């Protein structure tokens, strides 16, 4: 109960999965103190996972210790901890990417199975390795258990990364989908840009204003604004881009700063 | 962690909102006892999450402190702080009108972000003050932090107030839609009425039964009741009133009580 | 706070509900370890929620205290605690059965509302019995108070018990569904069976794959797999089983393993 862990899945909220988690968590370590991110990430987007959990690491204090769990290919792929002046459990399938950004790395490790089995006591399910596997593993590493005891230590080098930068063209971004929010608010991946006054949407017949509140244009008008991520947000006041663009997470737009 | 700090938002359950408000609130207070209400209040509805935090302040005890995020008109709107036997921690927008009605108010004060600044250390960005400004202010003040330290007192009857209240004429009720719930069941604005037999709605050519219970009709068949909230309510037996009168919140019905 | 306290319910994350069931419990039991499972139960549906609650009691300790609330029939059934090495605080209206196949159970009390008001002292409404009734008497037998002192024992014989087994015909099951989760995936009331090679959905033209997991199959491709709840789950990779056969809970299939 000295540090934080976090929660990112893209479980879903309706059913038993959470909980089963949780639980599990504090049998371990009864004293936990369990902070849910979010278990709505668009099913299977290992991309939306990592930008959410860059946003929660960003503003976490030192020693927090985050499990994340998006994990379609669950089977022969690594589960593994990433030790740094924060933690990550992960499945190594590239989630951890983004947080990495703003992490200083010790080492990772990854996690044995049959080590992990001896401090719960039950069968590892094929697919729920939430409940049997990185849930155990984040309440045990918050707990004083060093990941040593129940991993192997493996190269920081050796992990899986997605691909995450932008392209450029001339004049030409060429920026990705990365998160979609409840309004229909569209977080494309350039960062550290110099603000323009005008964002255009090539493929779309858009020249957006580019603003620092969704108030600042007629309510249906659609803006381009900094939002809170550090990223670049799309957005309609008082109404969805998502739904007008029709656009999803992974989509890849041609944009211009004016 | 001397008391609660419940949270009310519109801000969705689907990214890093909720998460990155309540680390920024951990990080300040580390002890706080943070209690979620909702997070899917119907988008930018100052009206729905006035209702839910009346609702919430009912039951709560007193010295519990109440953030309510629900701010379309972020940007030169004020970030408020109201001091009473409850602390209401929200924009002043209106959304403390309903919880207002069961708070004695001893001093109100306006949150100056420069303050806030000192305290968290980090840029406030342009839209998401639940995260650099409203959680922030919640965590200082169960903390012990008093509001002076980080704001100036206004007067109480200087803040924005919702008009909540019901229009009769002659026997007709005119009444808004307040809520409408999980289950579509539709909350109007009518409180402290003698129950009736009937509930009209002149609108829509339906008498209902006034019921206790919604297992006293038929499945599939409307009815009126009092519900748990103090107001009246609508609702299909195992269905969803809103879905059948194709209402919304904000919405005004005729209705005559008989 | 020596345990933990669970919630399930069908009330919905939009809304009030939660919250002041919450704020009740604390107000009662300020130091309770208040743990979410979900409140997003199809609605009205006691076989979900009761799947729910089976896997959640069996990863919890001895001694956790489980408040279900799905409760259609509001108004006379009976309101009980069920007292084992788990605790049940549920209607009496079968959401207790599938999770008592994992608990020994003791006594069991219907709770008396005139008694319990004592404790709570607000009136008990007619239809929010979680606020009203099974969250106070969740928190206080986490408390340490005994049920005998807001209920009455009564038989454990006597309780209402939903239907779940399923049947079989020559090599033929008739299964139900008891769980749709947030991806789609269907779970069938099939446990305790050998792991077949091959399930035929005979209603449907589908012979399936039985696989360990989901990336054992092409993307789009439907199979079964165990999962992780000891039932048998039918999946489509990367997509929703349920929207493909058109399925929901309380749907029967005709099912035969190869
Ligand atoms: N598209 C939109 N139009 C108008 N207001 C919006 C909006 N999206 C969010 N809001 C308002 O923004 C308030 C704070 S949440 C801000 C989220 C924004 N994407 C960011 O990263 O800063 C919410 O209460 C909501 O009512
Ligand atoms: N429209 C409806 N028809 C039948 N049962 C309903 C219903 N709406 C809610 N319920 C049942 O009511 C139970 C308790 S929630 C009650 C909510 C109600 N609006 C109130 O304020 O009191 C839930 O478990 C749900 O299954
Ligand atoms: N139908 C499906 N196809 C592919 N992957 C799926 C899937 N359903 C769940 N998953 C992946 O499974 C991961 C773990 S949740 C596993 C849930 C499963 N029903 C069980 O009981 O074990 C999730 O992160 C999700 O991305």
Not at 16 to 27: D, F, I, N, S, T
Not at 52 to 81: C, L
Not at 107 to 136: L, M, N, Q
């Amino acid at each position: 109960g000295s540090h934080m862990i976090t929660l990112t899945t893209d479980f879903g909220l309706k059913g038993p999965y959470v909980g089963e988690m949780k639980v599990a968590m504090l049998r371990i370590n009864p004293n936990a103190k369990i902070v849910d991110v979010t278990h709505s990430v668009t099913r299977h987007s290992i991309l939306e996972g990592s930008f959410v959990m860059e946003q929660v690491v960003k503003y976490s204090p030192k020693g927090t210790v985050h499990v994340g769990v998006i994990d379609p290919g669950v089977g022969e792929r690594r589960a593994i901890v990433i030790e740094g002046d924060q933690y990550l459990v992960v499945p190594d399938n590239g989630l951890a990417t983004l947080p990495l950004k703003h992490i200083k790395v010790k080492s990772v490790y990854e996690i044995i199975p049959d080590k992990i089995r001896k401090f719960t006591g039950w069968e590892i399910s094929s697919t729920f390795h939430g409940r049997d596997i990185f849930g155990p593993a984040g309440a045990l590493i918050e707990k004083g258990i060093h990941p040593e005891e129940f991993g192997r230590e493996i190269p920081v080098d050796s992990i899986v990364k997605l691909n995450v930068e932008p392209r450029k063209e001339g004049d030409v971004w060429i920026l990705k989908v990365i998160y979609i929010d409840d309004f229909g608010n569209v977080i494309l991946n350039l960062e550290n840009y110099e603000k323009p006054r005008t964002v255009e949407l090539l493929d779309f017949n858009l020249r957006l204003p580019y603003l620092e509140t969704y108030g600042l244009v007629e309510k249906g008008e659609m803006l381009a604004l900094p939002g809170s991520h550090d990223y670049l947000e799309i957005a309609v006041n008082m109404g969805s881009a998502a739904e007008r663009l029709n656009v999803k997470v992974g989509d890849e737009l041609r944009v211009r700063l004016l």
